[PDB]
Chains A and B, each alone.
Chain A
Amino acid sequence: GYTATWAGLASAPVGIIPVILSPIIGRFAHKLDMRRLVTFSFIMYAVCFYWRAYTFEPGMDFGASAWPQFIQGFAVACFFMPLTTITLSGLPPERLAAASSLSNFTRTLAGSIGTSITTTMWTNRESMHHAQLTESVNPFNPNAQAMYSQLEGLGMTQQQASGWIAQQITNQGLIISANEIFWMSAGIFLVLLGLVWFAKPPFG
């Protein structure tokens, strides 16, 4: 039931960390093996997503979805600068334009692909959970006729009560499916960790 402005406000705490650490990382870049920053960022991204996975609940306040982004601030802060420094390492000054164009093209393609996969997974797993849930709502079940009795107490018809129960099942399925995606993303991160070590150190 959030609004657009409130929903956007829940992602403010991501920028608290980078807006500070970005210069410090830039200032001290002379004495860091940037690969170790990339590895730390991947571990920090896995931590944040597992954090979201085991803590999302129907009655979670604004703070329950604001601490994880505060943590993700570190992960985002130490991922762009080092990896982009590695990406454009050793190339002559004249070609920096073409390399940047290629990098941006690949990154945008990746973003589009990620959105396309995630949305479909979310909806389909919501459907699966809906199927597995609506089974329990049948006759021959206490604490199922009681719900109908309480609903009819408020004046709702039988059909309206059925619709209300269906809506609740849908919401629960969305939360479960949404948390199943976060778990998968963190797991996938755990494997992408070590690839950054294949890059030679000509950085400069």
Chain B
Amino acid sequence: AATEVRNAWLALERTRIISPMTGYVSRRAVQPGAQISPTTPLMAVVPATN
């Protein structure tokens, strides 16, 4: 049961979508109220380092 608690907690903590890279936002196709799945593009981040 502790394992299932952990899985549920990770599911809840992932309702906040975090940026994996420092950069700048280019395209924005996400609006309040949109229905999102793990296959829908949301933004783009373009660093300027390398």
Residue on A nearest B44 in the bound complex, by CB: A140
A110 vs B38: C-alpha distance when bound (angstroms): 63
A142 vs B29: C-alpha distance when bound (angstroms): 8
B10-37 interface (Cβ within 8 A of A):
27-29
Q: Which residues of B contact A159 (CB under 8 A)?
A: none
| A141 contacts chain B at the CB level, 8 A cutoff | yes
A132 vs B27: C-alpha distance when bound (angstroms): 18
Q: Which residues of B contact A142 (CB under 8 A)?
A: 29
A104-143 interface (Cβ within 8 A of B):
138-142
Minimum C-beta distance from B45 to chain A (A): 13
Residue on A nearest B42 in the bound complex, by CB: A140
Q: Which residues of A contact B29 (CB under 8 A)?
A: 139-142
Minimum C-beta distance from B4 to chain A (A): 35
Q: Which residues of A contact B44 (CB under 8 A)?
A: 140
Interface centre among A138, A139, A140, A141 (most CB of B within 10 A): A140
Minimum C-beta distance from A67 to chain B (A): 45
Q: Which residues of B contact A138 (CB under 8 A)?
A: 27
Residue on A nearest B29 in the bound complex, by CB: A140
Q: Which residues of B contact A141 (CB under 8 A)?
A: 29
Minimum C-beta distance from B40 to chain A (A): 9
Minimum C-beta distance from A149 to chain B (A): 13
Q: Which residues of A contact B41 (CB under 8 A)?
A: 139-140
A53-84 interface (Cβ within 8 A of B):
none
A139 vs B44: C-alpha distance when bound (angstroms): 11
Q: Which residues of B contact A140 (CB under 8 A)?
A: 27-29, 41, 44
Beyond contacts A139-B29, A139-B41, A140-B29: 7 other A-B pairs, Cβ-Cβ < 8 A, are A138-B27, A140-B27, A140-B28, A140-B41, A140-B44, A141-B29, A142-B29
The 4 closest A-B pairs by CB, nearest first: A140-B27, A140-B29, A139-B41, A140-B41
Measuring CB to CB, which residues of chain A are less than 8 angstroms from any residue of chain B? Answer: 138-142
A-B contact pairs, 10 of them (CB 8 A): A138-B27, A139-B29, A139-B41, A140-B27, A140-B28, A140-B29, A140-B41, A140-B44, A141-B29, A142-B29
